[PDB]
Amino acid sequence: MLMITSFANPRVAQAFVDYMATQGVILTIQQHNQSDVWLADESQAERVRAELARFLENPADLD
């Protein structure tokens, strides 16, 4: 199990992880003050962890 980021919103999160998951990159929301977003596809850790910043200024896609 891996921790990636945290989303102000869970939808934001579910959407992302769902998105990531759509990318075949399995994330998930961890019950916390903030929608902590964990990575399941640890193979994607770096990715996901990376994706975020890309996912932030450029979500929706992968590149």
PDB file of N, CA and C in Angstrom:
ATOM      1  N   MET A   1       0.867  -1.202   0.000  1.00  0.00           N
ATOM      2  CA  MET A   1       0.000   0.000   0.000  1.00  0.00           C
ATOM      3  C   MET A   1       0.891   1.236   0.000  1.00  0.00           C
ATOM      4  N   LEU A   2       0.506   2.251  -0.763  1.00  0.00           N
ATOM      5  CA  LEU A   2       1.316   3.455  -0.859  1.00  0.00           C
ATOM      6  C   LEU A   2       0.497   4.725  -0.710  1.00  0.00           C
ATOM      7  N   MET A   3       1.119   5.737  -0.122  1.00  0.00           N
ATOM      8  CA  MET A   3       0.484   7.033   0.037  1.00  0.00           C
ATOM      9  C   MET A   3       0.996   7.948  -1.070  1.00  0.00           C
ATOM     10  N   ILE A   4       0.109   8.703  -1.702  1.00  0.00           N
ATOM     11  CA  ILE A   4       0.530   9.576  -2.796  1.00  0.00           C
ATOM     12  C   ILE A   4       0.326  11.041  -2.477  1.00  0.00           C
ATOM     13  N   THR A   5      -0.911  11.416  -2.229  1.00  0.00           N
ATOM     14  CA  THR A   5      -1.225  12.803  -1.982  1.00  0.00           C
ATOM     15  C   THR A   5      -2.490  12.892  -1.171  1.00  0.00           C
ATOM     16  N   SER A   6      -3.051  14.072  -1.135  1.00  0.00           N
ATOM     17  CA  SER A   6      -4.288  14.289  -0.433  1.00  0.00           C
ATOM     18  C   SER A   6      -5.088  15.332  -1.177  1.00  0.00           C
ATOM     19  N   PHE A   7      -6.363  15.066  -1.344  1.00  0.00           N
ATOM     20  CA  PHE A   7      -7.210  15.970  -2.088  1.00  0.00           C
ATOM     21  C   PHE A   7      -8.157  16.733  -1.185  1.00  0.00           C
ATOM     22  N   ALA A   8      -8.253  18.035  -1.428  1.00  0.00           N
ATOM     23  CA  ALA A   8      -9.142  18.883  -0.642  1.00  0.00           C
ATOM     24  C   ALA A   8     -10.523  18.273  -0.636  1.00  0.00           C
ATOM     25  N   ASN A   9     -10.884  17.684  -1.766  1.00  0.00           N
ATOM     26  CA  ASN A   9     -12.178  17.049  -1.896  1.00  0.00           C
ATOM     27  C   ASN A   9     -12.022  15.571  -2.188  1.00  0.00           C
ATOM     28  N   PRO A  10     -12.940  14.784  -1.715  1.00  0.00           N
ATOM     29  CA  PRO A  10     -12.944  13.319  -1.956  1.00  0.00           C
ATOM     30  C   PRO A  10     -13.369  13.045  -3.386  1.00  0.00           C
ATOM     31  N   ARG A  11     -14.380  13.775  -3.861  1.00  0.00           N
ATOM     32  CA  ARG A  11     -14.808  13.617  -5.245  1.00  0.00           C
ATOM     33  C   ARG A  11     -13.580  13.889  -6.089  1.00  0.00           C
ATOM     34  N   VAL A  12     -12.959  15.015  -5.765  1.00  0.00           N
ATOM     35  CA  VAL A  12     -11.715  15.423  -6.387  1.00  0.00           C
ATOM     36  C   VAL A  12     -10.786  14.226  -6.387  1.00  0.00           C
ATOM     37  N   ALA A  13     -10.791  13.558  -5.248  1.00  0.00           N
ATOM     38  CA  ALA A  13      -9.968  12.393  -5.031  1.00  0.00           C
ATOM     39  C   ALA A  13     -10.468  11.206  -5.828  1.00  0.00           C
ATOM     40  N   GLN A  14     -11.671  10.764  -5.508  1.00  0.00           N
ATOM     41  CA  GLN A  14     -12.257   9.635  -6.198  1.00  0.00           C
ATOM     42  C   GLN A  14     -12.122   9.847  -7.695  1.00  0.00           C
ATOM     43  N   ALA A  15     -12.382  11.069  -8.139  1.00  0.00           N
ATOM     44  CA  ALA A  15     -12.256  11.391  -9.552  1.00  0.00           C
ATOM     45  C   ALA A  15     -10.831  11.132 -10.015  1.00  0.00           C
ATOM     46  N   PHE A  16      -9.863  11.629  -9.250  1.00  0.00           N
ATOM     47  CA  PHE A  16      -8.463  11.440  -9.604  1.00  0.00           C
ATOM     48  C   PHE A  16      -8.111   9.972  -9.609  1.00  0.00           C
ATOM     49  N   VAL A  17      -8.237   9.342  -8.457  1.00  0.00           N
ATOM     50  CA  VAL A  17      -7.916   7.934  -8.353  1.00  0.00           C
ATOM     51  C   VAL A  17      -8.725   7.172  -9.382  1.00  0.00           C
ATOM     52  N   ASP A  18      -9.992   7.554  -9.554  1.00  0.00           N
ATOM     53  CA  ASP A  18     -10.815   6.907 -10.557  1.00  0.00           C
ATOM     54  C   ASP A  18     -10.150   7.160 -11.893  1.00  0.00           C
ATOM     55  N   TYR A  19      -9.721   8.403 -12.070  1.00  0.00           N
ATOM     56  CA  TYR A  19      -9.017   8.788 -13.273  1.00  0.00           C
ATOM     57  C   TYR A  19      -7.747   7.947 -13.361  1.00  0.00           C
ATOM     58  N   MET A  20      -6.908   8.045 -12.334  1.00  0.00           N
ATOM     59  CA  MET A  20      -5.680   7.264 -12.282  1.00  0.00           C
ATOM     60  C   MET A  20      -6.030   5.813 -12.546  1.00  0.00           C
ATOM     61  N   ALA A  21      -7.056   5.353 -11.848  1.00  0.00           N
ATOM     62  CA  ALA A  21      -7.537   3.995 -11.997  1.00  0.00           C
ATOM     63  C   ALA A  21      -7.937   3.770 -13.441  1.00  0.00           C
ATOM     64  N   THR A  22      -8.448   4.821 -14.067  1.00  0.00           N
ATOM     65  CA  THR A  22      -8.817   4.760 -15.454  1.00  0.00           C
ATOM     66  C   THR A  22      -7.530   4.545 -16.236  1.00  0.00           C
ATOM     67  N   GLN A  23      -6.470   5.199 -15.756  1.00  0.00           N
ATOM     68  CA  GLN A  23      -5.149   5.052 -16.344  1.00  0.00           C
ATOM     69  C   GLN A  23      -4.589   3.699 -15.941  1.00  0.00           C
ATOM     70  N   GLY A  24      -5.393   2.954 -15.197  1.00  0.00           N
ATOM     71  CA  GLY A  24      -4.985   1.652 -14.707  1.00  0.00           C
ATOM     72  C   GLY A  24      -4.124   1.827 -13.473  1.00  0.00           C
ATOM     73  N   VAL A  25      -4.105   3.055 -12.993  1.00  0.00           N
ATOM     74  CA  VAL A  25      -3.355   3.429 -11.815  1.00  0.00           C
ATOM     75  C   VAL A  25      -4.316   3.530 -10.658  1.00  0.00           C
ATOM     76  N   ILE A  26      -4.280   2.520  -9.826  1.00  0.00           N
ATOM     77  CA  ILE A  26      -5.191   2.441  -8.717  1.00  0.00           C
ATOM     78  C   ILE A  26      -4.778   3.278  -7.520  1.00  0.00           C
ATOM     79  N   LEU A  27      -5.605   4.264  -7.227  1.00  0.00           N
ATOM     80  CA  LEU A  27      -5.416   5.094  -6.055  1.00  0.00           C
ATOM     81  C   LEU A  27      -6.578   4.798  -5.132  1.00  0.00           C
ATOM     82  N   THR A  28      -6.805   5.655  -4.165  1.00  0.00           N
ATOM     83  CA  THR A  28      -7.913   5.482  -3.249  1.00  0.00           C
ATOM     84  C   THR A  28      -7.879   6.625  -2.247  1.00  0.00           C
ATOM     85  N   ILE A  29      -9.004   6.895  -1.610  1.00  0.00           N
ATOM     86  CA  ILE A  29      -9.069   7.974  -0.639  1.00  0.00           C
ATOM     87  C   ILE A  29      -8.953   7.421   0.771  1.00  0.00           C
ATOM     88  N   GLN A  30      -8.028   7.974   1.540  1.00  0.00           N
ATOM     89  CA  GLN A  30      -7.834   7.536   2.915  1.00  0.00           C
ATOM     90  C   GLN A  30      -8.570   8.491   3.849  1.00  0.00           C
ATOM     91  N   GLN A  31      -9.445   7.945   4.686  1.00  0.00           N
ATOM     92  CA  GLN A  31     -10.224   8.769   5.603  1.00  0.00           C
ATOM     93  C   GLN A  31      -9.315   9.599   6.505  1.00  0.00           C
ATOM     94  N   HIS A  32      -9.251  10.892   6.228  1.00  0.00           N
ATOM     95  CA  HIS A  32      -8.434  11.816   7.014  1.00  0.00           C
ATOM     96  C   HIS A  32      -9.032  13.213   6.925  1.00  0.00           C
ATOM     97  N   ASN A  33      -8.399  14.186   7.579  1.00  0.00           N
ATOM     98  CA  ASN A  33      -8.898  15.561   7.517  1.00  0.00           C
ATOM     99  C   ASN A  33      -9.055  15.957   6.060  1.00  0.00           C
ATOM    100  N   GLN A  34      -8.150  15.448   5.239  1.00  0.00           N
ATOM    101  CA  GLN A  34      -8.173  15.711   3.812  1.00  0.00           C
ATOM    102  C   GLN A  34      -8.262  14.383   3.069  1.00  0.00           C
ATOM    103  N   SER A  35      -8.796  14.412   1.860  1.00  0.00           N
ATOM    104  CA  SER A  35      -8.920  13.203   1.060  1.00  0.00           C
ATOM    105  C   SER A  35      -7.547  12.655   0.708  1.00  0.00           C
ATOM    106  N   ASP A  36      -6.880  12.043   1.692  1.00  0.00           N
ATOM    107  CA  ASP A  36      -5.571  11.456   1.437  1.00  0.00           C
ATOM    108  C   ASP A  36      -5.740  10.463   0.327  1.00  0.00           C
ATOM    109  N   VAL A  37      -4.904  10.579  -0.666  1.00  0.00           N
ATOM    110  CA  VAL A  37      -4.992   9.711  -1.805  1.00  0.00           C
ATOM    111  C   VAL A  37      -3.820   8.754  -1.831  1.00  0.00           C
ATOM    112  N   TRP A  38      -4.134   7.492  -1.640  1.00  0.00           N
ATOM    113  CA  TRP A  38      -3.126   6.458  -1.622  1.00  0.00           C
ATOM    114  C   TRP A  38      -3.032   5.772  -2.970  1.00  0.00           C
ATOM    115  N   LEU A  39      -1.875   5.188  -3.246  1.00  0.00           N
ATOM    116  CA  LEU A  39      -1.678   4.456  -4.484  1.00  0.00           C
ATOM    117  C   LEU A  39      -1.629   2.980  -4.180  1.00  0.00           C
ATOM    118  N   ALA A  40      -2.296   2.218  -5.010  1.00  0.00           N
ATOM    119  CA  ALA A  40      -2.309   0.782  -4.857  1.00  0.00           C
ATOM    120  C   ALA A  40      -1.334   0.207  -5.859  1.00  0.00           C
ATOM    121  N   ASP A  41      -1.380   0.768  -7.057  1.00  0.00           N
ATOM    122  CA  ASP A  41      -0.476   0.374  -8.119  1.00  0.00           C
ATOM    123  C   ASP A  41       0.901   0.924  -7.815  1.00  0.00           C
ATOM    124  N   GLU A  42       1.466   0.569  -6.673  1.00  0.00           N
ATOM    125  CA  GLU A  42       2.773   1.095  -6.288  1.00  0.00           C
ATOM    126  C   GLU A  42       3.700   1.247  -7.483  1.00  0.00           C
ATOM    127  N   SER A  43       3.572   0.363  -8.452  1.00  0.00           N
ATOM    128  CA  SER A  43       4.365   0.465  -9.666  1.00  0.00           C
ATOM    129  C   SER A  43       4.207   1.873 -10.234  1.00  0.00           C
ATOM    130  N   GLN A  44       3.074   2.453  -9.890  1.00  0.00           N
ATOM    131  CA  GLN A  44       2.682   3.772 -10.333  1.00  0.00           C
ATOM    132  C   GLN A  44       3.005   4.840  -9.296  1.00  0.00           C
ATOM    133  N   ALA A  45       3.460   4.428  -8.121  1.00  0.00           N
ATOM    134  CA  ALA A  45       3.778   5.380  -7.049  1.00  0.00           C
ATOM    135  C   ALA A  45       4.416   6.620  -7.616  1.00  0.00           C
ATOM    136  N   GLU A  46       5.613   6.427  -8.103  1.00  0.00           N
ATOM    137  CA  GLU A  46       6.375   7.482  -8.728  1.00  0.00           C
ATOM    138  C   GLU A  46       5.507   8.199  -9.733  1.00  0.00           C
ATOM    139  N   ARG A  47       4.783   7.398 -10.493  1.00  0.00           N
ATOM    140  CA  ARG A  47       3.881   7.894 -11.504  1.00  0.00           C
ATOM    141  C   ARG A  47       2.853   8.770 -10.859  1.00  0.00           C
ATOM    142  N   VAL A  48       1.974   8.140 -10.142  1.00  0.00           N
ATOM    143  CA  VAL A  48       0.941   8.832  -9.433  1.00  0.00           C
ATOM    144  C   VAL A  48       1.522  10.029  -8.727  1.00  0.00           C
ATOM    145  N   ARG A  49       2.461   9.771  -7.842  1.00  0.00           N
ATOM    146  CA  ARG A  49       3.105  10.856  -7.127  1.00  0.00           C
ATOM    147  C   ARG A  49       3.504  11.949  -8.117  1.00  0.00           C
ATOM    148  N   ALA A  50       3.891  11.514  -9.312  1.00  0.00           N
ATOM    149  CA  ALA A  50       4.288  12.424 -10.376  1.00  0.00           C
ATOM    150  C   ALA A  50       3.044  13.015 -11.011  1.00  0.00           C
ATOM    151  N   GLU A  51       2.145  12.122 -11.396  1.00  0.00           N
ATOM    152  CA  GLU A  51       0.902  12.504 -12.022  1.00  0.00           C
ATOM    153  C   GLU A  51       0.293  13.674 -11.322  1.00  0.00           C
ATOM    154  N   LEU A  52       0.175  13.613 -10.005  1.00  0.00           N
ATOM    155  CA  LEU A  52      -0.433  14.715  -9.298  1.00  0.00           C
ATOM    156  C   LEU A  52      -0.053  16.043  -9.932  1.00  0.00           C
ATOM    157  N   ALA A  53       1.141  16.530  -9.631  1.00  0.00           N
ATOM    158  CA  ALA A  53       1.595  17.807 -10.180  1.00  0.00           C
ATOM    159  C   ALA A  53       1.165  17.979 -11.627  1.00  0.00           C
ATOM    160  N   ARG A  54       1.144  16.889 -12.384  1.00  0.00           N
ATOM    161  CA  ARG A  54       0.726  16.960 -13.789  1.00  0.00           C
ATOM    162  C   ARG A  54      -0.788  16.969 -13.836  1.00  0.00           C
ATOM    163  N   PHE A  55      -1.335  16.206 -12.928  1.00  0.00           N
ATOM    164  CA  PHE A  55      -2.757  16.050 -12.748  1.00  0.00           C
ATOM    165  C   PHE A  55      -3.356  17.333 -12.201  1.00  0.00           C
ATOM    166  N   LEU A  56      -2.520  18.141 -11.578  1.00  0.00           N
ATOM    167  CA  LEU A  56      -2.973  19.392 -11.004  1.00  0.00           C
ATOM    168  C   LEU A  56      -3.056  20.453 -12.079  1.00  0.00           C
ATOM    169  N   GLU A  57      -1.947  20.678 -12.759  1.00  0.00           N
ATOM    170  CA  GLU A  57      -1.924  21.666 -13.821  1.00  0.00           C
ATOM    171  C   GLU A  57      -2.433  21.058 -15.112  1.00  0.00           C
ATOM    172  N   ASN A  58      -2.602  19.743 -15.140  1.00  0.00           N
ATOM    173  CA  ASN A  58      -3.050  19.115 -16.379  1.00  0.00           C
ATOM    174  C   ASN A  58      -3.707  17.755 -16.157  1.00  0.00           C
ATOM    175  N   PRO A  59      -4.750  17.706 -15.379  1.00  0.00           N
ATOM    176  CA  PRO A  59      -5.493  16.444 -15.130  1.00  0.00           C
ATOM    177  C   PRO A  59      -6.141  15.953 -16.415  1.00  0.00           C
ATOM    178  N   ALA A  60      -7.218  15.195 -16.281  1.00  0.00           N
ATOM    179  CA  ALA A  60      -7.950  14.712 -17.442  1.00  0.00           C
ATOM    180  C   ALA A  60      -7.136  13.709 -18.256  1.00  0.00           C
ATOM    181  N   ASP A  61      -5.951  14.119 -18.681  1.00  0.00           N
ATOM    182  CA  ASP A  61      -5.102  13.248 -19.489  1.00  0.00           C
ATOM    183  C   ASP A  61      -3.946  12.678 -18.672  1.00  0.00           C
ATOM    184  N   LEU A  62      -2.954  12.167 -19.390  1.00  0.00           N
ATOM    185  CA  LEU A  62      -1.766  11.590 -18.791  1.00  0.00           C
ATOM    186  C   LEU A  62      -0.550  12.378 -19.255  1.00  0.00           C
ATOM    187  N   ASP A  63      -0.721  13.106 -20.354  1.00  0.00           N
ATOM    188  CA  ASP A  63       0.361  13.910 -20.906  1.00  0.00           C
ATOM    189  C   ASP A  63      -0.210  15.068 -21.721  1.00  0.00           C
TER     190      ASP A  63
END
